[PDB]
């Protein structure tokens, strides 16, 4: 009946990424030098 009825976690304070060109450098070591695939749920289970 009430619109917006469907429409709390504190944000995780973590350091910002290295902007500028370093971001590209961050990707370069992300997949090639560092072991990859990406997107599995079980992969995040490893991350947690």
């Amino acid at each position: 009946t009430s619109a917006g009825k469907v429409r709390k976690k504190e944000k995780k304070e973590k350091p910002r990424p290295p902007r500028g060109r370093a971001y590209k450098r961050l990707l370069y070591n992300k997949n090639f030098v560092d072991d990859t695939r990406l997107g599995p749920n079980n992969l995040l289970i490893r991350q947690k």
Partner: protein
Amino acid sequence: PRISRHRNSSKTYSTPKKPFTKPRLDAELKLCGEYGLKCKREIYRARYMLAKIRRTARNLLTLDENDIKRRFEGAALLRRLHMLGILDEEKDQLDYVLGLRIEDIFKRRLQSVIVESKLAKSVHHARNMIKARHISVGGQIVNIPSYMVRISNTSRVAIADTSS
């Protein structure tokens, strides 16, 4: 009207007709990594220049060898390419021009000549040093990373005599 209306202006780069193409993305990223490129407009500028060279070479090649226009334009183009160092000295045929690639353009950048002289630890180190103004191209200090160095000045690119 104001005199400012007669100042000419034009763009200098192009964008790929198909943007999302995996091989192109990977190749562009790889070239950025080997040359420490900021954004992707520089590759577009390089491709623009290469396209101009190739089109001129084609038009001259369609014509006869003994065409006066052919002689004139080819001589000018060869002289410019050689003075820039992009094309090897031993080559003086217009046919070789069609085989040039943007990598030869990159190799004559200020960062490139700086690094291959072993004057810098890396492309990123070279860029940061260039910004701080520690380099004296010829006898004049230059703070433009994309400055292109001719053959006659490659032996003359040194450290700034004023830098600490």
